[PDB]
Design a protein around this ligand. Structure first.
Ligand SMILES: O=c1ccn([C@@H]2O[C@H](COP(=O)(O)OP(=O)(O)O[C@H]3O[C@H](CO)[C@@H](O)[C@H](O)[C@H]3O)[C@@H](O)[C@H]2O)c(=O)[nH]1
Length: 467
């Protein structure tokens, strides 16, 4: 038996990046051992500790000594804070790598998050293969690689463009729909994003959680070799498994309800833990759901701008979101819909045969989970690159419908009802379902014993073991 080479992972964001990073590492076990070298600006969170400690033994964690970010403006976007966090943690990253190399272990590669590219300098100085793990779309990867050119050939704010931005190999996108950090070109967020995009060519490869059957255009453009463009390895869809392949067979309460409903008849509504809606926006959605004949399963959170404090609370002690719904919504909805507070077993809901639709904020892991299990989408993007994902999902793949937002930022009930009704019982909804089932089959194929994605993973492992 050969000694497993060691690989170090530097994440820069929260769970949306840890989950796919962990899945990537699990696919490569036990050939390698892994260390999550997590930069921090304070005591690690309980969810971080719990998620990383639940991983197989070959993946351990090191929470780097926290850096001081108090000098940054309180207006600083997360991109700026992540870049500062990684840059200031690099000496501790050297120390961690030293602890491994001084014991005789071979450090084969350094896998950096999309905002941790400054750690590539460490890898280069130590003779370690630097790779970038890209937990988003090939379309967003293409945009990153083209950001330099776009920055030089456009002076105004991108929203002010009248024509849609053309990214090599992707559907056009309006400047207003481009990622959050580029909406204020004067903010440090944009300068950091630009700085990181120019460093992708320093890596030996970019590992992207997508596949050609989902993003044909961008992936074929990216695989086409050009000098100054890194190798790209499509390995998606990397997603967690369901609780069926976990352990005890105890059934959550929402899945009991889903069994009682008929096939493909429930619209799952989940904006994610960072998708709090205003009171008005949540009232517009509730009103449509109350007057609808559609069965739904809706995860709700306390709005961000309640006129008054909370009066009701849950046993744990947090604000009770259900007592904030409109008067009589719960009685009006009983039987047809089930409202859940804060969280739900998303993957298992999407794998349920009764689930027929998914109203989502278009987080890429959620998109990938919906695609793998074949649940068509209502694309309700909110922040980060979700608007880009929505354009590609609705106007490119045509596996969802996007409700138009108003001039005040509100998606009125008319648009919510339009997309719900079309998806769940219109004629376009059947064509969208057929297409999504085709992508479901393509997603299982690339993960097959000999598929596009499994071979790309094998290529990465081979490169790491080489030389
Ligand atoms: O109530 C919930 C909410 C989430 N999840 C799971 O937690 C993950 C959430 O994934 P995702 O929707 O992608 O979370 P985000 O935090 O929104 O992802 C961030 O990171 C992604 C990768 O860059 C980007 O695509 C997103 O835009 C960005 O917001 C998934 O595995 C969910 O199945 C649950 O089980 N229950």
């Amino acid at each position: 038996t050969a000694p497993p080479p060691h690989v170090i992972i530097v994440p820069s964001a929260g769970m949306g990046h840890l989950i796919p990073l962990a899945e990537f590492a699990k696919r490569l076990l036990p050939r390698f051992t892994f260390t999550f070298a997590v930069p921090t600006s304070g005591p690690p969170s309980s969810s971080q500790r719990d998620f990383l400690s639940s991983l197989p033994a070959s993946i351990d964690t090191s929470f780097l000594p926290e850096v001081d970010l108090s000098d940054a403006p309180s207006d600083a976007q997360i991109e700026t804070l992540m870049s500062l966090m990684v840059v200031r943690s690099l000496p501790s990253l050297r120390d961690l790598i030293a602890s491994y190399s001084a014991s005789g272990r071979r450090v084969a590669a350094l896998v950096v998050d999309l905002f941790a590219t400054d750690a590539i300098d460490v890898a280069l100085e130590l003779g370690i293969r630097p790779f970038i793990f890209f937990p988003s779309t090939a379309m967003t990867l293409s945009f990153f690689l083209h950001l330099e050119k776009l920055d030089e050939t456009v002076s105004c704010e991108f929203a002010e463009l009248s024509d849609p931005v053309q990214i090599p190999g992707c559907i056009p996108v309006h400047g207003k729909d481009l990622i959050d950090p580029v909406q204020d070109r004067k903010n440090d967020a944009y300068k950091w994003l630009l700085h990181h995009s120019k460093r992708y060519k320093l890596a030996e490869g970019v590992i992207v959680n997508s596949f050609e059957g989902l993003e044909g255009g961008p992936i074929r453009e990216l695989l086409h070799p050009e000098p100054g463009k890194p190798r790209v390895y499509p390995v998606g869809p990397l997603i967690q498994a369901g609780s069926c392949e976990k352990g005890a067979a105890a059934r959550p309460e929402c899945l009991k309800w889903l069994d009682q409903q008929p096939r493909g008849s429930v619209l799952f509504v989940n904006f994610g833990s960072g998708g709090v809606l205003s009171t008005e926006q949540q009232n517009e959605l509730a009103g449509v759901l109350a007057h609808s004949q559609q069965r739904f399963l809706w995860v709700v959170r306390p709005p961000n701008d309640g006129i008054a404090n909370a009066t009701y609370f849950s046993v744990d002690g947090e604000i009770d979101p259900l007592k904030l719904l409109p008067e009589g919504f719960l009685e009006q909805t009983a039987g047809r819909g089930l409202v859940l507070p804060m969280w739900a077993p998303q993957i298992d809901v999407l794998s349920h045969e009764s689930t027929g639709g998914f109203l989502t904020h278009c987080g890429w892991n959620s998109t990938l989970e919906s695609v793998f299990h074949g649940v068509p989408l209502i694309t309700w993007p909110l922040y980060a690159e979700q608007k880009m994902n929505a354009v590609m999902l609705t106007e490119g793949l045509r596996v969802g419908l996007r409700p138009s937002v108003g001039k005040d930022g509100i998606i009125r009930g008319a648009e919510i009802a339009r997309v719900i009704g079309e998806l769940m019982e219109g004629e376009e909804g059947k064509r969208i379902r057929s297409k999504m089932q085709e992508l479901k089959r393509a997603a299982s194929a690339v993960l097959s014993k000999d598929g596009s994605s499994t071979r790309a993973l094998e290529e990465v492992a081979k490169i790491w073991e080489s030389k």
